[PDB]
Amino acid sequence: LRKMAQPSGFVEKCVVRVCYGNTVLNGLWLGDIVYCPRHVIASNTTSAIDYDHEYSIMRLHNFSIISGTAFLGVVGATMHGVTLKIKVSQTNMHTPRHSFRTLKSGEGFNILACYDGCAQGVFGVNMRTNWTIRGSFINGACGSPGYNLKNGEVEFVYMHQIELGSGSHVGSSFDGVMYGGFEDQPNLQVESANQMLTVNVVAFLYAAILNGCTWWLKGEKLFVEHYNEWAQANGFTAMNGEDAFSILAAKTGVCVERLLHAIQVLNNGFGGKQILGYSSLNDEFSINEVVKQMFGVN
Amino acid sequence: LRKMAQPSGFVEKCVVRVCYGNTVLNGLWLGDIVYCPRHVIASNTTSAIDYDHEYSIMRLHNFSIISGTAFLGVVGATMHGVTLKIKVSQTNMHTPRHSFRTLKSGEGFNILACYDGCAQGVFGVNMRTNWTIRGSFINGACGSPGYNLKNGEVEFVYMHQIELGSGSHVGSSFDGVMYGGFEDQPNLQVESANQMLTVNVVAFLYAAILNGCTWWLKGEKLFVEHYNEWAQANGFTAMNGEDAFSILAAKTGVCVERLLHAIQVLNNGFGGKQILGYSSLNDEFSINEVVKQMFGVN
Ligand SMILES: *C(=O)[C@H](C[C@@H]1CCNC1=O)NC(=O)[C@H](CC1CCCCC1)NC(=O)c1cc2ccccc2[nH]1
Numbered sequence: 001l002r003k004m005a006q007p008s009g010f011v012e013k014c015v016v017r018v019c020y021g022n023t024v025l026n027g028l029w030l031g032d033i034v035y036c037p038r039h040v041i042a043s044n045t046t047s048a049i050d051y052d053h054e055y056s057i058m059r060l061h062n063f064s065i066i067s068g069t070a071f072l073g074v075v076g077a078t079m080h081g082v083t084l085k086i087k088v089s090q091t092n093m094h095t096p097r098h099s100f101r102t103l104k105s106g107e108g109f110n111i112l113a114c115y116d117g118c119a120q121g122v123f124g125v126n127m128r129t130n131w132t133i134r135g136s137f138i139n140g141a142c143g144s145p146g147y148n149l150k151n152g153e154v155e156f157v158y159m160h161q162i163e164l165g166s167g168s169h170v171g172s173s174f175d176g177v178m179y180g181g182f183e184d185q186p187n188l189q190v191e192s193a194n195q196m197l198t199v200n201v202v203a204f205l206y207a208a209i210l211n212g213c214t215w216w217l218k219g220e221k222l223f224v225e226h227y228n229e230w231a232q233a234n235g236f237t238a239m240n241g242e243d244a245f246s247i248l249a250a251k252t253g254v255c256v257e258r259l260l261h262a263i264q265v266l267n268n269g270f271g272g273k274q275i276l277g278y279s280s281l282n283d284e285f286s287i288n289e290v291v292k293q294m295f296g297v298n
Numbered sequence: 299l300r301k302m303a304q305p306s307g308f309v310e311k312c313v314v315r316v317c318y319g320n321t322v323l324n325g326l327w328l329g330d331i332v333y334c335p336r337h338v339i340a341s342n343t344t345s346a347i348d349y350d351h352e353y354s355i356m357r358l359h360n361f362s363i364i365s366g367t368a369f370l371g372v373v374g375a376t377m378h379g380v381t382l383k384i385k386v387s388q389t390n391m392h393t394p395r396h397s398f399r400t401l402k403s404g405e406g407f408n409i410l411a412c413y414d415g416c417a418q419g420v421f422g423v424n425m426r427t428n429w430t431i432r433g434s435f436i437n438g439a440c441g442s443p444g445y446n447l448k449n450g451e452v453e454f455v456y457m458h459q460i461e462l463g464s465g466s467h468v469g470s471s472f473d474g475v476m477y478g479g480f481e482d483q484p485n486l487q488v489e490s491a492n493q494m495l496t497v498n499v500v501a502f503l504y505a506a507i508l509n510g511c512t513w514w515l516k517g518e519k520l521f522v523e524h525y526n527e528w529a530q531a532n533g534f535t536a537m538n539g540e541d542a543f544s545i546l547a548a549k550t551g552v553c554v555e556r557l558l559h560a561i562q563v564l565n566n567g568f569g570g571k572q573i574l575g576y577s578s579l580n581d582e583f584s585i586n587e588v589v590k591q592m593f594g595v596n
């Protein structure tokens with residue numbers, strides 16, 4: 001069981017460099033629009049930014065947009081939430097089939113980490129319950145896109161915006177809505193406490209059974225409402241959609257509630273043993289990742 | 299610290315679907331040659347294989363090679379170690395600048411996991427000291443390529459071949475040499491014992507220091523010679539190349555000998571605490587990765 005990214009080839013062709021005055025970051029070129037964070041036009045980030053004022057003084061000739069080696073001709077730019085839509089005169093002939101989607105709590109996606117208009121890394125990640133992610137971004141990563149591949153099309157779900165004081169990372173949907181409601185402002189912002197994604201830990205243990213790792217499995221069941229009471233006080237999400245696990249419960253013969261029991265126990269530590277090579281419960285893998293990696297089903 | 303892959307776009311254009319009879323796996327199409335595992339032509343996989351015999355009875359009309367939706371035309375094939383070089387009429391016009399390199403023990407690289415000639419996932423891995431990797435492959439992944447991006451070119455380093463009884467994964471170089479000397483035969487083969495990569499664990503601990511996670515750091519030094527006598531009997535590799543860590547020692551003020559000392563004690567357990575979110579020592583990240591991810595430098 002390995003955490004994988006979906007391939008990045010369709011997305012790489014859309015990444016561009018967006019320069020405005022004294023700032024450089026990344027943009028996403030789809031059709032004749034380049035999407036990027038609006039804070040690229042902020043002329044002074046020492047203190048609170050009045051983005052209406054910044055937009056009113058914005059001058060189109062201060063933009064430079066580069067795709068690989070070619071300059072794109074900027075013809076207009078409008079502000080939408082915390083993003084800019086920059087109209088260029090060239091159409092990206094490598095625009096993939098795509099849509100835009102806003103992630104829900106816990107949902108998996110892929111980050112293409114880009115610098116200077118060029119992709120440098122790719123990884124799978126989950127939107128955490130506090131609406132941040134643990135990216136690896138350093139300065140210059142803003143505008144890096146997050147995406148999912150689904151039925152032959154690219155769902156664009158994340159545009160990188162800011163790093164919080166804690167080191168956690170916040171982006172926006174491509175509608176311009178910042179995840180978690182955080183502001184593109186210079187001052188300190190603090191995220192809510194993270195919660196372990198219970199549905200993913202369940203999938204993790206099903207994966208463990210399927211690979212023969214069963215030293216932790218016991219016959220006792222913990223009822224869902226009894227588990228949810230425990231979760232609320234111990235930093236775990238509640239259990240929902242138990243039906244979703246039916247394919248895994250059938251193939252293993254282990255009901256969900258026996259794994260809820262194991263979570264409550266295994267949270268106190270593994271005692272030196274390892275589950276699939278991990279020394280603590282892992283919440284990285286969704287049910288769909290587990291069935292895909294072990295069976296080839298989507 | 300997040301495990302990442304380098305982007306996959308350049309390599310996706312080279313993956314093809316290779317079918318011989320009723321066996322289907324992946325090929326790597328470079329110039330006018332398709333590289334793939336030679337066991338694609340083995341007519342009976344249930345017993346010892348005489349590849350000289352199988353090569354002598356190979357009939358080229360049994361091949362089907364598809365790139366996306368186009369069929370490639372086979373004009374010849376030759377056998378080189380545990381690979382086949384299949385000469386086609388068509389030159390891959392998306393062949394990147396590239397070379398073939400053979401991994402050293404402990405070296406990091408990227409896998410593009412493919413099925414039916416189509417990339418499905420991408421992840422970073424290390425060649426382990428026992429010449430296996432911890433992959434996540436199911437039937438049909440054979441021929442999936444491993445690569446590194448360096449200096450404006452693709453280094454092709456791994457062609458996926460077999461899964462061992464233990465679940466570990468074994469490949470060959472593209473020059474046809476199986477990593478670890480394993481055979482492309484259907485009998486049980488057992489790998490040697492894996493060792494923890496000391497230089498990676500030292501990189502890991504430096505990353506922890508750089509992130510102000512030093513609860514585990516003490517003042518005592520442990521000399522390299524003494525660490526190494528402990529390592530040889532405790533499942534860790536010897537410490538080498540401590541000059542690369544000089545820049546991190548200088549930057550941090552913490553010499554390598556204080557981290558070797560920490561490895562010795564922390565191997566016994568973390569006492570319920572965590573380091574960068576891990577519950578035990580982690581050997582997945584090289585010094586190169588740590589420096590690239592935190593400081594942007596190759
Ligand atoms: C865009 O390229 C960068 C990417 C940041 C920088 C480091 N790691 C990242 O992910 N984003 C920024 O530089 C913003 C700048 C805008 C923020 C919104 C309003 C003004 C401009 N800066 C940060 O995100 C930032 C600064 C900072 C200082 C100390 C601790 C954390 C921190 N995060």
Ligand SMILES: *C(=O)[C@H](C[C@@H]1CCNC1=O)NC(=O)[C@H](CC1CCCCC1)NC(=O)c1cc2ccccc2[nH]1
Nearest residue numbers: 337343435436437438439440460461462463482483484
């Ligand atoms: C190629 O696509 C597959 C990839 C394997 C399949 C399962 N997970 C993988 O990574 N490789 C194979 O199918 C080889 C084919 C053999 C042909 C004859 C010579 C040796 C290779 N089979 C295996 O790798 C294999 C069979 C097997 C049976 C029981 C336990 C493990 C196991 N691994």
